Amino acid sequence: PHELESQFILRLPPEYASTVRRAVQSGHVNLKDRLTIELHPDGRHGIVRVDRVPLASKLVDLPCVMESLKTIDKKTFYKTADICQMLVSTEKKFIWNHGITLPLKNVRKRRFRKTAKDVEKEVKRLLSTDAEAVSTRWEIIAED
Amino acid sequence: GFESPRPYKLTHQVVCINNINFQRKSVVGFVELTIFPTVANLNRIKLNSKQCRIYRVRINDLEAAFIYNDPTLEVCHSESKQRNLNYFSNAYAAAVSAVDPDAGNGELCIKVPSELWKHVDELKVLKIHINFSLDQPKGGLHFVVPSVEGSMAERGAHVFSCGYQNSTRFWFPCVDSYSELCTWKLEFTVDAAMVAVSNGDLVETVYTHDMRKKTFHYMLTIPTAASNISLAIGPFEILVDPYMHEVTHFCLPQLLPLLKHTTSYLHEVFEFYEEILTCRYPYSCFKTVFIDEAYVEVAAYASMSIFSTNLLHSAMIIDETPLTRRCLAQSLAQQFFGCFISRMSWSDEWVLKGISGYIYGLWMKKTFGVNEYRHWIKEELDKIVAYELKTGGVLLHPIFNPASHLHFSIKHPHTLSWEYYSMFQCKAHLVMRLIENRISMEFMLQVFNKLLSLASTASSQKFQSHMWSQMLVSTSGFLKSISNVSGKDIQPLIKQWVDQSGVVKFYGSFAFNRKRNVLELEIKQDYTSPGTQKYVGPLKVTVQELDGSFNHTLQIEENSLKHDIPCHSKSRRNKKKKIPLMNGEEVDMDLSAMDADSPLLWIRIDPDMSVLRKVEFEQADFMWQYQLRYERDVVAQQESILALEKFPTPASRLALTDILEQEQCFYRVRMSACFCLAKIANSMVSTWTGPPAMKSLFTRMFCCKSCPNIVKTNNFMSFQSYFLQKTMPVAMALLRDVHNLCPKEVLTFILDLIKYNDNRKNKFSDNYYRAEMIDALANSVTPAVSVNNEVRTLDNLNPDVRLILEEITRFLNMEKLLPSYRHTITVSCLRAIRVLQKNGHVPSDPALFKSYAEYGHFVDIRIAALEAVVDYTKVDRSYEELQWLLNMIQNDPVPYVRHKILNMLTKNPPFTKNMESPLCNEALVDQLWKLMNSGTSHDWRLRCGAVDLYFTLFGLSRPSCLP
Amino acid sequence: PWNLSNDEYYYPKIIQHSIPAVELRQPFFPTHMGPIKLRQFHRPPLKKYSFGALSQPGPHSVQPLLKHIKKKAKMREQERQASGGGEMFFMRTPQDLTGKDGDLILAEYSEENGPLMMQVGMATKIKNYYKRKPGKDPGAPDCKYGETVYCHTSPFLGSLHPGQLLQAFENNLFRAPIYLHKMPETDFLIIRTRQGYYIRELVDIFVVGQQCPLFEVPGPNSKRANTHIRDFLQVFIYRLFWKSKDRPRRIRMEDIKKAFPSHSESSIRKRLKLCADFKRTGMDSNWWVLKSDFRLPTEEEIRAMVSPEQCCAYYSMIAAEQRLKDAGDDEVRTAPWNTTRAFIAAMKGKCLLEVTGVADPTGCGEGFSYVKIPNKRFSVAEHQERYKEECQRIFDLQNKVLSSTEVLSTDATGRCLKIYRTFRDEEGKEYVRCETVRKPAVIDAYVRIRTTKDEEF
DSSP states (O other): OOOOOEEEEEEEEHHHHHHHHHHHHOOHHHHHHEEEEOOOOTTTOEEEEEEEEEEEEOOOOOOEEEEEEESSSSSSSEEEEEEEEEEEEEETTTTTTTTTSSSSIIIIIIIIIIOOOOHHHHHHHHHHHHOEEEEEEEEEEOOO | OOOOOOSSEEEEEEEEEEEETTTTEEEEEEEEEEEEEEOOOOOOOEEEEESSSSEEEETTTOOOEEEEEOTSSSOOTTOOOOOOHHHHHHHHHHHHSSOOOOTOOOOOEEOOGGGHHHTTEEEEEEEEEEEEESOOOSSSSEEEEEESSSHHHHTTEEEEEEEEEOOGTTTBBBSTTTTEEEEEEEEEETTTTEEESSSSEEEEEEEESSSEEEEEEEEEEEEEOGGGEEEEEEEEEEEEEESSEEEEEEOOTTTTHHHHHHTTTTHHHHHHHHSSSOOOOSSSSSEEEEEEOOOOOOOOEEEEEEGGGGOOOOOTOOEEEEEEHHHHHHHHHHHIIIIEEEESSTTTTTHHHHHHHHHHHHHHHHHHHHHHHHHHHHHHHHHHHHHHHSOOOOSSSSOOOOOSSSSSSSSSSGSOOHHHHHHHHHHHHHHHHHHHHSSSSHHHHHHHHHHHHHHHHHHHHHHSSGGGGEEEEEEEHHHHHHHHHHHHOOOOOOOOOTTSSBBBEEEEEEEEEEEEEEEEEEEEEEOTTTTOOOOOOOOEEEETTEEEEEEEEEEOOOTOOOEEOOOOOOTTTTOOOOOEOOSSSSEEETTTOSSSHHHHEEEEEEETOSSSSSEEEEEEHHHHHHHHOOOSSSSHHHHHHGGGGGGOOOHHHHHHHHHOOOTTBBBBHHHHHHHHHHHHHHHHOOOOOOOTTHHHHHHHHTTOOSSSSSOOOOOOOOOSSSHHHHHHHHHHTTTTOOOOSSSHHHHHHHEEEHTOOOOSSSOOOHHHHHHHHHHHHHHHHOOOOOOTOOOOOSTOOHHHHHHHHHHHHHHHHHHHHOOSSHHHHHHHHHHHHHHHHTTSSSOOOOOOHHHHSSTTTTTHHHHHHHHHHHHHHHHHHOOOHHHHHHHHHSSSSSHHHHHHHHHHHHSSSSSOOOOOOOOOOOOOOOHHHHHTTTTTTTTSSHHHHHHHHHHHHHHHHOOOSSS | OOOOOOHHHHHHOOOOOOHHHTTTTTEEEEEEEHHHHHTTTTTOOOOOOOOTTTTTTTEEEEEESSSHHHHHHHHHHHHHTTTTOOOOOOOOOOGGGGGSSOOOEEEEEEESSSSSSOTTTTTTEEEEEEESSOOOOOOOOOOSSSSOOSSSSSSSSSSOTTTTTTEESSSSSSEEEEEEOOOOOOOOEEEOOOEEEEEOOOOOOEEEOEEOOOOOOTTTTTTHHHHHHHHHHHHHHHHHHTTOOOOSSSEEEHHHHHTTSSSSSSHHHHHTTTTEEEESTTTTEEEEEEEOOOOOOHHHHHHHOHHHHHHHHHHHHHHHHHHHHOOOOOHEEEEEEEEHHHHHHHTTSOOOOOSSOOOSSSSSSHHHHHHEOOOOOSHHHHHHHHHHHHHHHHHHHHHHHOOOOOOOOOOOOEEEEEEEOOOOOOOOOEEEEEEEEOHHHHHHHHHHHHHHHHHOO
């Protein structure tokens, strides 16, 4: 079978980003030894090791949706993957408010329309507790 | 690749004109050509010249010897006793080929002096200075000099270059081919009160030392041919376009407000033609000249167009705005693709005519709507299938005879019949629509942009034709550019519709198989008629069933007859649901007339007109009525109107009446439904229940609510109920009673429409509506019951016709004091007097029409009166009227009138070849042979018209009525 | 003297995807999307592998792929020059759609949830619309990507200025203005697969403005919706019959039940009733063999059955159905069936749109709102011109804000719910727990089930 590839964006500190960029544009396999990525079983924490120097990482959710688009002639572009996550290196904490481009900053707060009426999972847990019970008493309340 | 048929290459030409004398109708001038010989030992140089008296010729300021002979002056010898037309057609083709600049030939043969042979062998420049004079031209330059006294600018005298194709040889010596491109320098020394308009841009205008004349200097740096060079000298009122500022409009004096209103649309035509193609307008200026006694209604030259003044209308004139608008549009289309990109041979003319007509049809689509586009395409297709089934066929791109089924040679444009030239342009633009159907419209516009871009990179070089021949298109270059942009080649479509000269005829009939739920079509072709050919490609058919509209492609090979296509359900008759149409919408249909076992509502064979075809489909009458009512295609509504005339059932009357009452139907479908309803009403007399047809509908739509017989006061601001209102009594007058006489209820209705007409309140004129009222009065005239050939006098007049005669007398006399826009009521009243004379009502006397056909009248009055005289000399077998018409062909000042008299005498001939007539002498055969041979030697359109008249009257063999 | 063709009553109104996309292959075009997969629609989380090299916990080296990129590009150029040198079609396999080769750009979206969005494997074009200056103009400012076209009639709602080039994504789904920005200097692109990590740099990232929809998303329970569900199931059944190696082609029912598990089996039987029959006994037992008289449709007929853009419109509909369902009339107006119908009707000139409203995906004055307003003391030119000018103003504000490279500084009853629960502890006990829910969101979802279960009796 075929499994859709999973692309994400890696953001590094600027000096380490310059060393990683120089090693990528060089093209040797020396970069392979220099750059490693260890993702912790939390799922939202990691180490990126640049030149064997550990950096602390967080995998965050991006507010917009990006899409990688490949081309052969630079006139027709084929969508290859959807990017929604970034492993910035240096829950509410795992949500990034800004977008990658310069015009998109504070997009989640300002350029996103918010419509409102985790919570569903809590309601399911409450229903399960009511089922495991015997007698349930309920009242919409006031200030108390 | 273009290799010249001439052994020299022309680089630059100076045309200087002095001494334009309007009293004596004379010009003097010189011409200086700059040729580079391509072959050594050039010796003779052959140029084109007609009607010019060549005074002297100097080559490199050395005196040279020329010899002039024109074989097309007298085509056959005077003392040859041949009288068949095939001899004249071969001799005329050989004579035109002997002066052809598309071969190496020419009429003026100049001998290079001996001392320049060492200058010509090593190929160096030659400057030929001819000076000439036109003494009193019978062609080329037309001098319109009115007989009011005053100065020549005070009386309105002007000159313009007339003619078609290569007719610039008629006013200066040149290489009069479309393939000899050169740059130009044009000087015209005219009177101080006159302006000289020509091709190029006006670099200066200097005075003469007496300040009584001034010289206009034009320069043309874009290399054009000699055939695209024009001239208009007159006392023109100049108007700069207030939107585009390189465009100047010239009109005759006192016609400036008409020019302001008329030429106010042209910037939108410019914007369209520069937005669908991506090239800007190639020339640096544009000039529109409006003149009197024009050759054609619209002529297009390089950076210039010459229209007639009869196109100029004011703001209150409708029914003339679209016609003038589309004349301007096709002149601009020919500016792009007839004058900038030119022709490589006489073949590959179909390319240019097709691109011009196709982009003009795209303009018509955007401007007047897709429905007007479909109606125009259908009327052009009906025109060509009528002409090709009538006589042989039109052959785009012949190979050099290739077409021997027709009485002229197609090797040169000046031997073609004028009807063949018109059908040539018509078929060329329809074949270009077919190429757009195979290869999509955006790729087509990319082809045209590639041609224009090659031409405009070519147009700026200075190399003498190393690169100036990229401005000439051919068929192979056009097909190669198509194959470059699309990757598909159209060589089967080119082989079928261009190289083969025929249209196809389809006879279809269906049968619905209820058991297997299929539709068995039966399409057979008539391929043994003289104009037809056999189609073997694919064919689209559109079937409207209860489940919707489905398209099917059928492969119609030679041995094919039965095509089984599948049919869908009939579950939209189980429940009442809406039936979905060809577009996305759906409607409620009354399914009571439909068959219970078949789901299919109508069938259309080739709906998109993707072949050059004539379809004869055999549906049932309810299918034609459903196709008239609920179709979303105007050509299918028109063909259902055309096919409902064979079914006079009252359901068809209800269908056409529901079409007539329906706004949001296209107006030209309702105008056809009027005449179809009149024919159906005439066929179901002694069954018709209530009032005459369309009368109650006219009083419901166009009359007052409180007074049914008083018409509403004229407000023509809707432009669709105006056309329907002016076309409904014209069809209503074709009603006939059981006695074959028009009823006195419809004639009284038309006369009350005439009496109660009030036009003091609309912003538009009433001339076309009143002219159509006279046409409706003329339609009601039935033949009178003469007893013992009783002389038609005033007392034994019909009581019906006395009212009609009083009305047309009142209208014609009031036109003599308050004239209409183009004397439309004069034309309608002359036509109605000829209608009354054709029946036994007014005495058959041509003296009225002979007085209206004099020179000083308007040209529409002249051609209406001459049409009446041609009809009279056909019916009364008049010898002296035929001699009057032939004399008017020989010496009339307006050449358009001469061409129109030959045209009308060809369409309505005084006798055919089958008839024994008293007018079949040897004298008439000798007169018409002298008119073909000599006499019409100055026009190239009168000579082809005389060939057409001799073919219509005496046929292709020896005139029979002869010793 | 005018149009006079009643065209609004007669006529009321190129992209080649990859061979995995036009054949609707199941990684790229999913048959079924559950609720947690509809909430993560076009935002796929980083999944943990169970087997593979990355499934073992620890540090993992990323691998540079620049010999791979230039080797694949040189190989594709050899293929193109061996085939005559013209333009070729390369995306014929799923392995052509990897990010490991070719020139990648990124494309960011301004809206959170667009009305239409491309699946993986689908193609789009970049068109550079350039309105010439009045009279003389130098020529289109040249651009690295896309082809240039001269637009006298603006494709978008606003109109282009003279001498203004605007790039845009153009495909069958939408048309949207894009704006090229340079990438940040710190961000790289890591392509992880089962075997390892791979790294590319990126240099070009476009920002995609508000989409102009060209395809109408169907509504829920619509006729077009049910037709697409039935046709998608039929195409999947035909492609399972084509994949069958048995000489009487035969499939199993629980393959289709694995693909479409929300479908009642009455609908799957209905699709298999014509074109197949169930064998209970003998050979081919418990298989749905293909009928011997049935001609299985060819590949082009199966491609003509369902289009990929119809699948994208269906996925947009069911994702919006989930988002609306989770959030308990303003929101219903912002649903893509309503907004796509409104925009396509506005493009046919049926009706006008209030360009300021609640369907605005920004939530501020930037961006349009595609909800229908009637086209009706002026009742004609005033309304039309007002709508047109508001459209040009919004188009021009969005272009400016998006192309800005300026840095932006980082910035009813009032009643709670209380529940008493009675349970039995180990051995013998009867403790009662009183729990108070102060979250009004938890409240709404909780109560709605009881009120439903109270009526569910």
